[PDB]
């Protein structure tokens, strides 16, 4: 419904295809030149944005200080035009809300899949790999939507970093991480 139309509007606005080592996935712009992408996707210091060589200004491999994986990487890409601050559209209120997984990769060209109500996992381990601040939705997903923009109408919950089976794992993109100066 309105979530789908928002996704298309967010698409043209802050979403672009990033060619990482894992493949060409979805990159969500947060504000200015600040974008976000998963870690195991392996983004370089210079990367291809829509196939175009571009260099990364600032690269924040964002995990918990204690080596606990958030599987998230925030990067300031060197692009002239700025992304619209969808930071005030971040929904750090997650659990109980219906979320839609919007993935725009080279393969998945804007696949808007409504997944249902998202819940908070918190800190869980995945095969001995400790992950902290994961948002989890119980939905049998066909894994491969790395970078999938988990959103709803005016609500960015985070991005699907790597879900598998009935556990769609998304990272919690809370505004705290995008606070420029604290």
Swiss-Prot record:
Catalyzed chemical reaction(s): Selective cleavage of Gln-|-Gly bond in the poliovirus polyprotein. In other picornavirus reactions Glu may be substituted for Gln, and Ser or Thr for Gly
Domain Peptidase C3: 1-178
Active site: 40 (for protease 3c activity), 71 (for protease 3c activity), 146 (for protease 3c activity)
Cell compartment(s), UniProt: Host cytoplasm
Source organism superkingdom: Viruses
Function, as annotated: Major viral protease that mediates proteolytic processing of the polyprotein. Cleaves host EIF5B, contributing to host translation shutoff. Cleaves also host PABPC1, contributing to host translation shutoff. Cleaves host NLRP1, triggers host N-glycine-mediated degradation of the autoinhibitory NLRP1 N-terminal fragment.
Protein name per the record: Protease 3C
Organism phylogeny: Viruses, Riboviria, Orthornavirae, Pisuviricota, Pisoniviricetes
Included range, full protein: 1538 to 1719 of 2179
